[PDB]
Structure formats: structure tokens, C-alpha cells
Design a protein around this motif. Structure first.
Motif, PDB file in Angstrom:
ATOM      1  N   UNK B  38       3.089  -4.969  16.139  1.00  0.00           N
ATOM      2  CA  UNK B  38       4.296  -5.714  15.104  1.00  0.00           C
ATOM      3  C   UNK B  38       5.551  -5.195  14.619  1.00  0.00           C
ATOM      4  N   UNK B  39       6.203  -3.593  15.688  1.00  0.00           N
ATOM      5  CA  UNK B  39       7.219  -2.392  14.867  1.00  0.00           C
ATOM      6  C   UNK B  39       7.370  -2.309  13.448  1.00  0.00           C
ATOM      7  N   UNK B  40       6.954  -2.906  12.770  1.00  0.00           N
ATOM      8  CA  UNK B  40       7.807  -3.318  11.309  1.00  0.00           C
ATOM      9  C   UNK B  40       6.940  -1.723  10.525  1.00  0.00           C
ATOM     10  N   UNK B  41       7.934  -1.124  10.552  1.00  0.00           N
ATOM     11  CA  UNK B  41       7.886   0.486   9.968  1.00  0.00           C
ATOM     12  C   UNK B  41       7.773   0.730   8.911  1.00  0.00           C
ATOM     13  N   UNK B  42       7.014   0.443   7.637  1.00  0.00           N
ATOM     14  CA  UNK B  42       6.961   0.301   6.461  1.00  0.00           C
ATOM     15  C   UNK B  42       5.090   0.206   6.299  1.00  0.00           C
ATOM     16  N   UNK B  43       4.487   2.145   6.477  1.00  0.00           N
ATOM     17  CA  UNK B  43       3.475   1.552   6.305  1.00  0.00           C
ATOM     18  C   UNK B  43       2.917   2.015   4.239  1.00  0.00           C
ATOM     19  N   UNK B  44       1.942   0.692   3.799  1.00  0.00           N
ATOM     20  CA  UNK B  44       1.884   0.490   2.854  1.00  0.00           C
ATOM     21  C   UNK B  44       1.147   1.380   2.357  1.00  0.00           C
ATOM     22  N   UNK B  45       0.422   1.814   1.189  1.00  0.00           N
ATOM     23  CA  UNK B  45      -0.435   2.890   0.955  1.00  0.00           C
ATOM     24  C   UNK B  45      -0.291   2.303  -0.496  1.00  0.00           C
ATOM     25  N   UNK B  46      -1.866   2.533  -0.639  1.00  0.00           N
ATOM     26  CA  UNK B  46      -2.485   2.106  -2.340  1.00  0.00           C
ATOM     27  C   UNK B  46      -3.002   3.199  -2.800  1.00  0.00           C
ATOM     28  N   UNK B  47      -1.802   4.258  -4.357  1.00  0.00           N
ATOM     29  CA  UNK B  47      -1.773   5.074  -4.501  1.00  0.00           C
ATOM     30  C   UNK B  47      -3.098   5.566  -5.325  1.00  0.00           C
ATOM     31  N   UNK B  48      -4.148   4.495  -5.357  1.00  0.00           N
ATOM     32  CA  UNK B  48      -5.380   5.067  -6.495  1.00  0.00           C
ATOM     33  C   UNK B  48      -6.251   5.373  -5.154  1.00  0.00           C
ATOM     34  N   UNK B  49      -5.950   5.313  -3.912  1.00  0.00           N
ATOM     35  CA  UNK B  49      -6.248   5.357  -2.943  1.00  0.00           C
ATOM     36  C   UNK B  49      -6.637   7.446  -2.569  1.00  0.00           C
ATOM     37  N   UNK B  50      -5.096   7.766  -2.684  1.00  0.00           N
ATOM     38  CA  UNK B  50      -4.916   9.462  -2.753  1.00  0.00           C
ATOM     39  C   UNK B  50      -5.202   9.666  -4.227  1.00  0.00           C
ATOM     40  N   UNK B  51      -5.550   9.430  -5.304  1.00  0.00           N
ATOM     41  CA  UNK B  51      -6.329  10.024  -6.091  1.00  0.00           C
ATOM     42  C   UNK B  51      -7.600  10.317  -6.487  1.00  0.00           C
ATOM     43  N   UNK B  52      -8.226   8.918  -5.930  1.00  0.00           N
ATOM     44  CA  UNK B  52     -10.035   8.937  -5.085  1.00  0.00           C
ATOM     45  C   UNK B  52      -9.317  10.167  -4.326  1.00  0.00           C
ATOM     46  N   UNK B  53      -8.987   9.815  -3.661  1.00  0.00           N
ATOM     47  CA  UNK B  53      -9.393  11.157  -2.430  1.00  0.00           C
ATOM     48  C   UNK B  53      -8.575  12.164  -2.830  1.00  0.00           C
ATOM     49  N   UNK B  54      -7.646  12.982  -3.574  1.00  0.00           N
ATOM     50  CA  UNK B  54      -6.694  13.869  -4.386  1.00  0.00           C
ATOM     51  C   UNK B  54      -6.125  13.596  -5.518  1.00  0.00           C
ATOM     52  N   UNK B  55      -6.574  13.841  -6.601  1.00  0.00           N
ATOM     53  CA  UNK B  55      -5.559  13.591  -8.127  1.00  0.00           C
ATOM     54  C   UNK B  55      -4.580  14.403  -8.261  1.00  0.00           C
ATOM     55  N   UNK B  56      -5.275  15.866  -7.088  1.00  0.00           N
ATOM     56  CA  UNK B  56      -4.310  16.681  -7.529  1.00  0.00           C
ATOM     57  C   UNK B  56      -2.489  16.325  -6.383  1.00  0.00           C
TER      58      UNK B  56
END
Ligand SMILES: Nc1ncnc2c1ncn2[C@@H]1O[C@H](COP(=O)(O)OP(=O)(O)OP(=O)(O)O)[C@@H](O)[C@H]1O
Ligand SMILES: [Mg+2]
Ligand SMILES: [Zn+2]
Ligand SMILES: [Zn+2]
Ligand SMILES: [Zn+2]
Lengths: 257, 259, 591
Positions: B38-56
Motif C-alpha cells: 500500500x505504501x501507507x506509512x501509518x501503523x495504527x495500534x490499539x493501545x488496549x493490546x499493549x495494556x494486555x501485553x504490558x500494562x507498564x
């Protein structure tokens, strides 16, 4: 004498300015024409009989007698027109203690569609048909206000909160200039029959100040000579609308000749 | 660590890279590959995923968004230069987290949230045409046309008031076109009526979309906007430097979720 | 006295390109182009971007990157090139217009990062402002020190000199403008919006203001779609700034042989089969109108409108209409709005609108005061937006008298001459009009003449090629079939349609057929004469009489039917079918 660097700059020079003024004043006496009737004396007498302060000068006579002077008239219309006005005023006062000089018989006549930026700020003669005319508007004054508590001057405002500091003071007039001390505005369009069918007829706006005011009526075909120059208009900063400062007007008898 | 925080650039980047690589609903690598084509340089990430993986890490991200997001950007760019090491992009990948702290009680918002990433759901009421804001002003001398540049003069532009080649008085004027600008769009968004318990006075917020994410929300659209809470001073008079003791506050959007 | 090495190098290279680059003939094409430019009214010279790119790729890249920075130097180079060559006026403005730019950005893509660099955009003009001279390089005199400040360039605003010219004097507030010495250029503010092709569904279009100057001032008229090559710039507005696209050149947006060469092999094969496909008429009608039952004649007429006849201009400067106008007068429901919606959806350049629209334009060009500028601007209406397209106007019977007379003039002369508030313009509008209307009282009284059934004025009715009457028949079979169609559509959410030809295929076929201009054979001429003889002999009673206007509509429909098969000459088959259609459209009083 001539052949300087710029026609406007050359005429602006005091030396050549007075040279041309004296030459024109002398011509106001010498030019008796082949008739020998002292054409200029006749014009002065006719004007003073009714005190019309309106002088008619034929471009052909100036071109033939002087040549270079008539050549410089188109490039520096205002300067030489003022020179001729002062010369005529002095002559009238001498013979009969302002005089406006109106030129005519311009060699080249340009249609409204034929004039462009190449003809901006120059005298030209065109043939048109009047379409609309207003009254004798008193005056158009541009007022610039020195700001209240800020090093800035408010933009020109036409007549007839600071952009930077937002000062609420009433401000004081930094500079007020008067234009068209008494003027009539008319509109002239291409005469019917000269339009190229589909093309919408061209229109231009002319201003007649002091002299020539109310010298035309709507619906009259006129050969108008004047300075086609830009100038302020009744409308941030005021819009610069191109107009024709009318120097001379005529009437085409029968509307077809 | 950066002052007044618990953040290490190297350790934070390594933790973010580990989160990108080691995760279970790997989607991040999939969308990295998608961005490749695509070339679309914007990686959208759901922060809740980080919360589950690492709350810190989630807490660290929320507390210091402005200082942490660049580390995530650098980590993502390094990964993109690892996977698909060869590729062409006008600007390297960027990460725009979202859906992290649903303090959608906009009426219940506190100064403790200043400079902290927050997501709020609401319907945009008004917008405006993209505003070009200067970032490198260009000046030329009226006398000698000495060209000069003033870069990122902390919002305002520092007028030299004196030239540098003729060293004349203040005569160097700014050239708008020769300057450099960035896109900044202002939006006025109203709090979602449904979420308000009382709704006696619906709340409104001001959002600024910078350099991207402009015109992505039309008026009346109900969206979840995640961005950095911001408070800025207001000067009593532009001429004077005095500022009000009460700050006006707005949001610098990071991500939009249509909903 | 600071010299921009980039600017000087670009000027040198541009002059070299002008005086060396040559066409395939081996001669400097731009020499002859400038020789043409010497004539009055010709102050802009076009330049092919690809040509100069081939001459010097680095030069083209630099100009693209810093077009705005170097443009004045390009103009100076043009001035030098033209002055020394021939007898051109010593001092008149000259400009360079760039074209052939492969990069075509979208109004969405215009970002601040693109400020100052050359780019080409495509849009549709919405409103056009009056021309106005504007000072570009002002000249002032300090009042205190009476020294003439010269060449104090203004960046699109009333920028007075910062301080006096004299180091001795520091007036700084009382500069006087020298109008005669000031340099002015004619600017026109236009507004453009995203063309429907690029417009995302249900998304508000982006309105972009553009500035036109020199030869481009009058090039673009309201309501037309055009491509502008120029550079986006910023302009201060009462450190606020707003975007405006200063366009150096304006061109119309985007032959049968050219299309066929451009068309793909598979697409051309499909179109060739379509042309060779007999009975393509009914097949295409049915394919284009799946969610409809009956009203085969209405679909036939709509398709013929979609194709259109051959416009003709007489030697006396008289324009003979080439496209046709259709009206559908129908009882409540009966799928009129459905017909118009289908036509709008299928055909690009087709715009749907209603006679109840309250827009200041009012379904046609108007003159309105700008809310901010307060200067009268010619705003294009929907009818104008349908230029060289189709205008599906619903509630045609409910139009206002103002819009009614405007539309009458538009459909009569194919152009709208709008003059008011001192502004004047003549906007071309060659648009096929598909109107929908309801009978007076709601239900069509078949025992009354059409005039008594509709409130439209006599001129509007006379200037319509075809009227289609849709009466709600009480027949049980028809209602059963209509219910079958609707229920099948709603249950079989999709796949209920049976399109013998795809919509894109129909669009490309229509574009290919448009390229043909069928002629009338002497056999076709006499057949038309005989058909009109019969039509006149009919002389009945018919709702509306038959005049030469009907003969014109007949010949236009015959031209359209000839265009259907792409044959370049008319045959009696087309004439007889058109006669059948028009005669059937006539409804006799049933009293
Ligand atoms: N002859 C017909 N064949 C098939 N469907 C029909 C027919 N007449 C009406 N319909 C159906 O009627 C439905 C409703 O009609 P619609 O809303 O399009 O009417 P309309 O022409 O806009 O009416 P009006 O303008 O008189 O109010 C449409 O979905 C169309 O499917
Ligand atoms: Mg309807
Ligand atoms: Zn001020
Ligand atoms: Zn300097
Ligand atoms: Zn001074």
C-alpha cells in the motif's frame, strides 16, 4: 531637448519641463496657421466670450509644427496636459486677467476590444456608445488613519480595530487625498454593428471631472479621447478599477456617417 | 531517563519491538506487510493490546505520549528496514495509537490529564479549511535582498530587525511563498449526548490535526478521537506578553476511529 | 543586489532551451510560437513541459521543485527573447504557460508541502468573479523626504514600504502611492470543486480558490470542467494564511480513431461486437433498466437522449441543436424519479436536481453577492453543471417562473446570457434535459389536452423533443408484474438484475459512439420528407399540434438512432423507427 532615458522621467525633469512649457507658450502665439488669423487668439477670444475654460487643440497642428512634442504627448499625457493647462491659464490671464486644455484629432483610434495593457496609462481615442450615466458626484476621498497605539497606518478607506495590534482607538487621519473633485461616471460599450456577433460587446467606464461633466446623454454615440489608466474605486484595501479619464468628447451626428 | 518520568529510550524501544513481534490476538507484522504494498506509512495500534501485553508500557505511553511515540516510530522504522529491508517510502512509517483510556466523560475531565493521551467519543460539529502554519520563515532585504531563514521560532517568528550583508536597519521582509508550511486543521467536536448522564450542558472540545489526518472527519460524524490533551496560555493583549492564569485547553489528535 | 544562483542558472538554461530546442522538423518551434505571440491579445506563450524535460531533465526538476521562485526569471527570459527578435511593443507584459505535466494531483492531495511548486489539478468551476486590476510591483514616494520608492513588491496585499528609502529620513507612515508608475496585472478569482469522478461518495467536495491572469482570465467560464496548470500559494487574510492556486494555464478537461487506439483490445472487441450485435436497441434498454416493468417507449427515448444527435452550426452563425430534451408526465408513483435516478447513476456528467431547489443559482446560472467579498459573482447552477451532459430535473411542473424563463431561454438558444448588477456574461449550455412532471390535480385526464394537464408554458412544451405519458393502468396483469419485479428485487438483494451488458461496457460504448457524426443520405432525406408528410397529414385529436419543431425533433432522433449502430450514414430503418417513436408519444384526446 529629447532622447533621454524614459519619456515619463524625461518630462518630469524640471529643465525639459520648462523647456516644453516655454515652447508650447510660444506656439500659442506663433501658430497663426496658413490662414494667418492667429488661431490661438481666436480660441482664447471664443473661450473668454463665455469663459468656458475649455481649449480645443488639434493633434495634427502640434505634430506638424513641433513633431517631437506631439510624439511625447501619448507617452506622458498627464504631464504635458498640465503644462498646456498652465500655459493656457497664463495666456488667458495675460489677455484677460484654471484653464483646461482638451485635445482631439488623435491619429489612431482604437476600439474597446483593441485596447490592452500596452495602452494603460496613456491617452487614446475610441468610438463607443454610452449606456449609462450618473449624476455629478461630489468627490472621492481616500482616508488613511494612523493607528492608535501601534506603529502602523490603516489601509486606504474610500469616502464620498488594527490588523496587527487590534487597537480599539478611533485612530487619527494619517493622510487624506481627494480625487475627482466633481465628477460624472459614464459607461461606454462597443457601438452596435461592430461586435463580432457571438462576442459580448466590450464595456469601459469613463470619468468626466469638472470640464465635460454632463456633456453626454445615455444612448449617444461618442468619440471619446482620454487617459486609459488605473485608479481607485468606490469599494481590505480599495479595489483598483481601470477607467478612462475623459479629456475630450465629441458627437457623431446622425449616429451613422 | 528523560526528566521527571520513568522512560528509557533504548529499553522502551526494545519493549515496543517485542510487543510488535511477540503478540497474540502478529497482526502488526501483517499490516506492516500490507503497508509495504500500500505504501501507507501509518501503523495504527490499539493501545488496549499493549495494556494486555504490558500494562507498564501502556501506563508509560499514556503518561508521556509526546516523549514515547517517537520511540515507537523509530522501532517501527527499524523493523520495516528489517522486514522488507529494501523498499521506497517518502517518509518512514509512523504509529498512531488509539482506544487507550475511555475517559469519555468529557464533562468530567481534570488538569491531571494535561499532556496525556486520551480517547473520547463524540460527534464533530464544525471544522475549518486546512491552515498553513509556518515552520521555516524566509526573509529578504528590501535594500540588498539578503536572503535569510529563521527555523521553528517557537510558534512566533523572530524578526531580525537588521540585515546581515548591508547590515542596514530593519528592512528584511518575510516572503510567504518562499517559506515552509505545515497543515493544521481545527475541528470543534461536541460530546456524545448519549454518554452524558445528565446532559444539562453538552460539552465541546477543540481538536487540531497536524501535518496529516486532515479532513478525515466530515461535520456531524460520530467518531472516537484519540490525542494528547493540551493546555496553552492566552495573552491578555497580543502586544503585551502577559498571560491569563487560566489556560484554554484543546486536543492534538493522534488517531480517528469512525463509529 | 543579491543574485540567486539558482534563478540565474534557470534563466540561462531556459533561454538556451527557447533558442535551441527544435521540433522534429529541426526548427525552433517556440520561435514561430513567439512570432505568433507578437500579435495583440497574445501575451502568454505555452511551453511543453516534456519538451524542456527532454532538453534538460535537471532544469525541469528544478522548475518543478521551485517553479514559483524561478517564474519571474522565466518571464524575464521570455521578454529578452521576444524583444530582440521582432517588432514587438517595447513594454507589455509577457508570461509563460506550462502544459503536458504528467503528474495530475487531486484537490485532496494539495497539501502545504506542495506550496510553491508546479502542479496540475482538475476541477469544475463553480463561480467566477469579475476581473480586477491588482498592483504587483508598487511604487511609492515618501512624503517627508519626497523620494520615490520603486519596485516595492506586494504579496497580494496592501504592503506599504517598511521604512523610507532615505537613511536620513524615517517617516515610515506617510508613503504616497504612484498609481501611474505602479505595475498592475489583471486578476480574476475563480472557485473550483472536486469533479464528481474524483468525489468520494457522500463526502463534501473541497472548494479551492484560483487566480487567473493574462490570457487565462476569460478562458474558464462558470460551470465548466477544466484542468489548471499552476502552483499552490499562500495569501494573508484578515499570521493567518489561506490557500489559493495561481494557475498559469487553463485547459478544457481531457476522435473515434484516437479512442479506438487508446481503447484496450478486449474493450474494443466488446464494442465491435456491440456494434455488430443486432437488436442491440432493446437489449441495451433492458440492461440499463432492470428494476422497471413496461414503459419500453420511455426507456427507448431515454437511451436515444443518452446518445444524442449531431449538432450543426450554420454559415450564418446559427446553432442547430444536436441534443434532445425529454419530459415524463406521470401519475403518482410510476417510477419517474426512478427513471431519472437510473439515468443519473449510470451516466457520468449527468446531474440530478429538483424543481424545488432553493439554491441562489436556482437550477441555472445566477449573479449573487459574495458573503465575504460582497462583490457580485456569477454562480453556476445545476443546469450549467450538466454542461455537455444530462440534467435530470424532477418536479419540473413545480419550477419557479424565474427559473422557468431561464430554462426556456437555455433550451431555446442553448446559451444563457446573464446580465445584472453591472456584470454580464454569456454561458454556453448544451445540455440534454430530462424532466419529470405530474399532471395537474395529480392524475392525468386522458380526455383533456396536454396543455390542460400540465402548467408548463407553451414555449417550454414546444421545445421538448418527446413527451412520455405514464398512466397508472388498472390492469391486474401489469400490477402483478410490477409487484413481481419489486419483490424479486427486494428478496434477491442482488443477482435479480439481468444485464446483457455491464454498466461500464455501456459507458464505453456510448463514448465510442459519440465520436460518430452520422450524415443523412438523399434516400434518408426523401424518407424523412415522406414521414413528415404522413405526420402532417395526420393532423390529429392530438394533445399538441405538429409543427416544424416536431420535424426537427424527428431528424435529431434519427441522427441519434444512426449513432446507435455507429453507422456514419442514415438509413430508412432509423427514420422509420424514429417516426414510430415520436408518433406513438403523441396521445389523442379520449373524450
Ligand atoms: N411500471 C413500473 N414497473 C416497475 N416498478 C415500478 C413501476 N411503477 C412504479 N414502480 C416502482 O414504484 C416504486 C416507487 O415509485 P417511485 O418512488 O420511483 O415514484 P416516482 O416516479 O418518484 O413518483 P411521483 O414523482 O409521482 O411521486 C419504485 O421503486 C419503482 O420500483
Ligand atoms: Mg418522485
Ligand atoms: Zn495598531
Ligand atoms: Zn540588506
Ligand atoms: Zn522618508
Amino acid at each position: 531637448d529629447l532622447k533621454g532615458h524614459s519619456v515619463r522621467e524625461w518630462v518630469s525633469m524640471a529643465g525639459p519641463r520648462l523647456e516644453i512649457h516655454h515652447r508650447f507658450k510660444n506656439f500659442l502665439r506663433t501658430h497663426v496657421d496658413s490662414h494667418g488669423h492667429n488661431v490661438f487668439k481666436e480660441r482664447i477670444s471664443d473661450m473668454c466670450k463665455e469663459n468656458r475654460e475649455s481649449l480645443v487643440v488639434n493633434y495634427e497642428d502640434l505634430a506638424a509644427r513641433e513633431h517631437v512634442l506631439a510624439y511625447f504627448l501619448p507617452e506622458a499625457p498627464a504631464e504635458l496636459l498640465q503644462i498646456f493647462d498652465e500655459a493656457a491659464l497664463e495666456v488667458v490671464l495675460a489677455m484677460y486677467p484654471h484653464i483646461h486644455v482638451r485635445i482631439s484629432h488623435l491619429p489612431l483610434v482604437e476600439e474597446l476590444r483593441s485596447l490592452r495593457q500596452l495602452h494603460l496609462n496613456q491617452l487614446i481615442r475610441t468610438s463607443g456608445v454610452v449606456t449609462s450615466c450618473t449624476g455629478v458626484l461630489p468627490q472621492l476621498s481616500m482616508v488613511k488613519y494612523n493607528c492608535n497605539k501601534c506603529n502602523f497606518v490603516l489601509g486606504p478607506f474610500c469616502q464620498s480595530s488594527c490588523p496587527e495590534c487590534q487597537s480599539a482607538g478611533p485612530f487619527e487621519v494619517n493622510m487624506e487625498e481627494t480625487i475627482y473633485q466633481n465628477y460624472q461616471r459614464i459607461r461606454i460599450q462597443e457601438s452596435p454593428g461592430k461586435v463580432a456577433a457571438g462576442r459580448l460587446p466590450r464595456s469601459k467606464d469613463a470619468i468626466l471631472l469638472a470640464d465635460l461633466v454632463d456633456s453626454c446623454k445615455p444612448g449617444d454615440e461618442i468619440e471619446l479621447t482620454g487617459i486609459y489608466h488605473n485608479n481607485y474605486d468606490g469599494s481590505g484595501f480599495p479595489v483598483f478599477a481601470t477607467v478612462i479619464l475623459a479629456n475630450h468628447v465629441a458627437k457623431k451626428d446622425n449616429k451613422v456617417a | 531517563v528523560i526528566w521527571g518520568t520513568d522512560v528509557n529510550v533504548a529499553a522502551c524501544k526494545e519493549n515496543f519491538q517485542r510487543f510488535l513481534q511477540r503478540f497474540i490476538d502478529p497482526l502488526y507484522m501483517q499490516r506492516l506487510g500490507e503497508i509495504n504494498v500500500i505504501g501507507e506509512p501509518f501503523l495504527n495500534v490499539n493501545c488496549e493490546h499493549i495494556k494486555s501485553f504490558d500494562k507498564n508500557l501502556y501506563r508509560q505511553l499514556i503518561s508521556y505520549p509526546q516523549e514515547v511515540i517517537p520511540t515507537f516510530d523509530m522501532a517501527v522504522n527499524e523493523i520495516f528496514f528489517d522486514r522488507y529491508p529494501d523498499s521506497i517510502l517518502e517518509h518512514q512509517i509512523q504509529v498512531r495509537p488509539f482506544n487507550a483510556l475511555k475517559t469519555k466523560n468529557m464533562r468530567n475531565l481534570n488538569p491531571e490529564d494535561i499532556d496525556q493521551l486520551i480517547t473520547i467519543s463524540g460527534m464533530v460539529i464544525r471544522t475549518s479549511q486546512l491552515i498553513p502554519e509556518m515552520q521555516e520563515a524566509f526573509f529578504q532585504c528590501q535594500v540588498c535582498a539578503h536572503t535569510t531563514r529563521v527555523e521553528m521560532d517557537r510558534g512566533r517568528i523572530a524578526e531580525p530587525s537588521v540585515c546581515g550583508r548591508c547590515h542596514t536597519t530593519h528592512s528584511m521582509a518575510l516572503i510567504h511563498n518562499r517559506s515552509l508550511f505545515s497543515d493544521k486543521q481545527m475541528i470543534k467536536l461536541q460530546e456524545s449526548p448519549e454518554d452524558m448522564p445528565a446532559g444539562q450542558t453538552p460539552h465541546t472540545v477543540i481538536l487540531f490535526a497536524h501535518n496529516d489526518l486532515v479532513d478525515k472527519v466530515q461535520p456531524g460524524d460520530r467518531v472516537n478521537v484519540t490525542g494528547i490533551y493540551r493546555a496553552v496560555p492566552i495573552r491578555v493583549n497580543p502586544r503585551v506578553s502577559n498571560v491569563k492564569s487560566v489556560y484554554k485547553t484543546h486536543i492534538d489528535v493522534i488517531h480517528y476511529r469512525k463509529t | 543586489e543579491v543574485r540567486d544562483e539558482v534563478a540565474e542558472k534557470c534563466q540561462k538554461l531556459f533561454l538556451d532551451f527557447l533558442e535551441e530546442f527544435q521540433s522534429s522538423d529541426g526548427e525552433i518551434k517556440y520561435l514561430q510560437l513567439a512570432e505568433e505571440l507578437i500579435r495583440p491579445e497574445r501575451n502568454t506563450l505555452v511551453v511543453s513541459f516534456v519538451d524542456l524535460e527532454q532538453f534538460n531533465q535537471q532544469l525541469s526538476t528544478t522548475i518543478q521543485e521551485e517553479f514559483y521562485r524561478v517564474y519571474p526569471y522565466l518571464c524575464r527570459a521570455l521578454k529578452t527573447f521576444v524583444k530582440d527578435r521582432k517588432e514587438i511593443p517595447l513594454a507589455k507584459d509577457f508570461y509563460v504557460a506550462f502544459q503536458d505535466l504528467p503528474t495530475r494531483h487531486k484537490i485532496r492531495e494539495l497539501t502545504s508541502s506542495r506550496i510553491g511548486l508546479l502542479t496540475r489539478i482538475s476541477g469544475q468551476v463553480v463561480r467566477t468573479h469579475p476581473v480586477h486590476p491588482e498592483l504587483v510591483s508598487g511604487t511609492f514616494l515618501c512624503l517627508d523626504c519626497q523620494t520615490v520608492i520603486r519596485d516595492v513588491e506586494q504579496q497580494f496585499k496592501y504592503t506599504q514600504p517598511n521604512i523610507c528609502r532615505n537613511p536620513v529620513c524615517a517617516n515610515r507612515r506617510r508613503f504616497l502611492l504612484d498609481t501611474n508608475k505602479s505595475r498592475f496585472v489583471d486578476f480574476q478569482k475563480v472557485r473550483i470543486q472536486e469533479t464528481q469522478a474524483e468525489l468520494p461518495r457522500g463526502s463534501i467536495p473541497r472548494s479551492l480558490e484560483v487566480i487567473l491572469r493574462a490570457e487565462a482570465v476569460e478562458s474558464a467560464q462558470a460551470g465548466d470542467k477544466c484542468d489548471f496548470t499552476g502552483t499552490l500559494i499562500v495569501v494573508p487574510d484578515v499570521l493567518s494564511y489561506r490557500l489559493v492556486f495561481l494557475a498559469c494555464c487553463v485547459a478544457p478537461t481531457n476522435t473515434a480513431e484516437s479512442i479506438k487506439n487508446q481503447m484496450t483490445v478486449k474493450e474494443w472487441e466488446k464494442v465491435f461486437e456491440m456494434s455488430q450485435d443486432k437488436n442491440l436497441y432493446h437489449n441495451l434498454c433492458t440492461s440499463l433498466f432492470p428494476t422497471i416493468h413496461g414503459n419500453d417507449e420511455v426507456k427507448r427515448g431515454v437511451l436515444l437522449m443518452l446518445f444524442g444527435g449531431v449538432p450543426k452550426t450554420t454559415g450564418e452563425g446559427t446553432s442547430l441543436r444536436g441534443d434532445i430534451n425529454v419530459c415524463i408526465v406521470g401519475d403518482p408513483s410510476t417510477a419517474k424519479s426512478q427513471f431519472l435516478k437510473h439515468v443519473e447513476e449510470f451516466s457520468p456528467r449527468a446531474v440530478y436536481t429538483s424543481g424545488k431547489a432553493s439554491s441562489a443559482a436556482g437550477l441555472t446560472a445566477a449573479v449573487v453577492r459574495d458573503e465575504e467579498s460582497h462583490e457580485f459573482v456569477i454562480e453556476a447552477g445545476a443546469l450549467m453543471l450538466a454542461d455537455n451532459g444530462v440534467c435530470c430535473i424532477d418536479e419540473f411542473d413545480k419550477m419557479d417562473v424565474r427559473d422557468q424563463v431561464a430554462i426556456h431561454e437555455a433550451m431555446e438558444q442553448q446559451t444563457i446570457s446573464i446580465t445584472k448588477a453591472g456584470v454580464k456574461a454569456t454561458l454556453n449550455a448544451r445540455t440534454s434535459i430530462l424532466a419529470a412532471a405530474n399532471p395537474i390535480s395529480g392524475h392525468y385526464d386522458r380526455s383533456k389536452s396536454l396543455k390542460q394537464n400540465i402548467n408548463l408554458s407553451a414555449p417550454i412544451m414546444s421545445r421538448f423533443d418527446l413527451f412520455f405519458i405514464l398512466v397508472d393502468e388498472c390492469n391486474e396483469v401489469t400490477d402483478y408484474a410490477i409487484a413481481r419485479r419489486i419483490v424479486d428485487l427486494h428478496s434477491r438483494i442482488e443477482e435479480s438484475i439481468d444485464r446483457v451488458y455491464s454498466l461500464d461496457d455501456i459507458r464505453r460504448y456510448l463514448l465510442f459512439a459519440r465520436q460518430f457524426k452520422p450524415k443523412i443520405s438523399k434516400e434518408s432525406e426523401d424518407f424523412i420528407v415522406e414521414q413528415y408528410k404522413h405526420l402532417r397529414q395526420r393532423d390529429g385529436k392530438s394533445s399538441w399540434r405538429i409543427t416544424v419543431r416536431q420535424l426537427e425533433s424527428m431528424i435529431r432522433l434519427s441522427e441519434a438512432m444512426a449513432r446507435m449502430h455507429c453507422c456514419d450514414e442514415v438509413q430508412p430503418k432509423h427514420v422509420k423507427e424514429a417516426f414510430r417513436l415520436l408518433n406513438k408519444s403523441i396521445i389523442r384526446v379520449e373524450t
